[PDB]
Amino acid sequence: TADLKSLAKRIYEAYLKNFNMNKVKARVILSGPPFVIHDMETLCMAEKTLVAKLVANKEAEVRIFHCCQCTSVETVTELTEFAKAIPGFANLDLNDQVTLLKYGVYEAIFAMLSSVMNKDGMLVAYGNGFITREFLKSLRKPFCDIMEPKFDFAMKFNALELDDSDISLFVAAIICCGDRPGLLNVGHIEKMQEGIVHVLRLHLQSNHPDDIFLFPKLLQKMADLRQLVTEHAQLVQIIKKTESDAALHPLLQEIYRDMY
Ligand SMILES: CCO[C@H](COc1ccc(C(F)(F)F)cc1)CSc1ccc(OCC(=O)O)c(C)c1
């Protein structure tokens, strides 16, 4: 359908406009310049070059965690502007918009994070760094436990070989969940959701004719992400309570407040 075909395009264009990183841009960088962070020496070098103000000191693990949070805060802003392209989102009650973004952002973050991840590491700092998976595993607990579950999800997610046209709709569908707690107008949100999911189903059928189960596979990935986010918040809570030097950005505190 032209109406749905153009809706898919609208979403895709809002995704390209509002997110600094996309899969094509990430694969260009990852093909072959990003500074490689593989040990403590290269981490400290990268900090002096890419986040100089940060180290003009606390444990490396705490500094890394603060850099992680800065990326989240930035992606929240990107996701908030992206949400406007979703038919009906800007028409929802202002409180429902906040609730949908509150519960959706981290699911969206980890879904999109897969695009800059491969089995050896991930792009960081607006594509200018590459931190290795093994270095992250080498951090002292509990900080070494943060990223490995995200790599596990990303390797299987990337095996699906989605492109940005698919991912834009997937992220839209994540935001349009009518079963988020505290929604005022569930019925309108469900209809909004049904509309995005309908476009996603048709788009996957056209864009991925070789994989007839791709749509149900992504439905399951949405459930997987919800559990990934729940477990992530639990680890974040442990760090907040037991790491006196690891403070949470207030915007991210509110997102976690009364989540899981
Ligand atoms: C390490 C994984 O983090 C990536 C960026 O981390 C950086 C590490 C080092 C540097 C620097 F280049 F400055 F050294 C930059 C980013 C961003 S992805 C991310 C996003 C959110 C995360 O959880 C924090 C949160 O709940 O908001 C975590 C643990 C990771």
Residue numbers in the entry: 200 to 231, 237 to 260, 265 to 468
Show sentences the authors wrote:
PPARs belong to the nuclear receptor superfamily and the ligand-activated transcription factors; they exist in three subtypes in mammals (namely, PPARα, PPARβ/δ, and PPARγ) with considerable amino acid identity (54–71% in humans). The ligand-bound activated forms of PPARs are stabilized by associations with specific coactivators, thereby enabling the regulation of specific gene expression. The carboxylic groups of the PPAR ligands are known to stabilize the AF-2 helix 12 through hydrogen bonds (red dotted lines) and electrostatic interactions (blue dotted lines) with the four surrounding consensus amino acids: Ser280/Tyr314/His440/Tyr464 in PPARα-LBD, Thr253/His287/His413/Tyr437 in PPARδ-LBD, and Ser289/His323/His449/Tyr473 in PPARγ-LBD. When compared to the LBPs of other nuclear receptors that have 600–1100 Å3 cavities, the LBPs of PPARα/δ/γ have relatively large (1300–1440 Å3) cavities that are able to accept 1–4 ligand molecules.
Due to the fact that seladelpar is a relatively low-affinity PPARα/γ ligand, its cocrystals were obtained by cocrystallization with a delipidized PPARα-LBD or with PPARγ-LBD and SRC1. X-ray diffraction has revealed the monomeric structures for PPARα and PPARγ, as well as the dimeric structure for PPARδ. The electron density maps located a single seladelpar molecule per PPARα/δ/γ-LBD protein monomer. The obtained PPARα/δ/γ-LBD helical structures were identical to those of previously reported active conformations described for lanifibranor above. Seladelpar was found to be located in the similar position of the “Center” and the “Arm II” regions in PPARα/δ/γ-LBD; however, its orientations differed. Likewise, the orientations of the carboxylic group of seladelpar toward the four consensus amino acids in PPARα/δ/γ-LBD were different from those of lanifibranor. The PPARδ-selective agonist seladelpar activated PPARδ with the highest potency (EC50: 20.2 nM) and efficacy (99.3%) compared to PPARα (1.64 µM and 41.0%) and PPARγ (3.53 µM and 58.5%). Some other consensus amino acids, such as Ile272/Cys276/Phe318/Leu321 in PPARα-LBD, Val245/Cys249/Phe291/Leu294 in PPARδ-LBD, and Ile281/Cys285/Tyr327/Leu330 in PPARγ-LBD, were stabilized by all three ligands, whereas some consensus amino acids (i.e., Leu247/Ala250/Val255/Ala333 in PPARα-LBD and Leu255/Glu259/Phe264/Ser342 in PPARγ-LBD) were specifically stabilized by seladelpar and other consensus amino acids (i.e., Leu347/Phe351, Leu320/Phe324 and Leu356/Phe360 in PPARα/δ/γ-LBD, respectively) were stabilized only by lanifibranor. Seladelpar could activate all PPAR subtypes; however, the EC50 values for PPARδ-LBD were ~2 orders lower than those for PPARα/γ-LBD, and this is why seladelpar can be used as a PPARδ-selective agonist in clinical use.
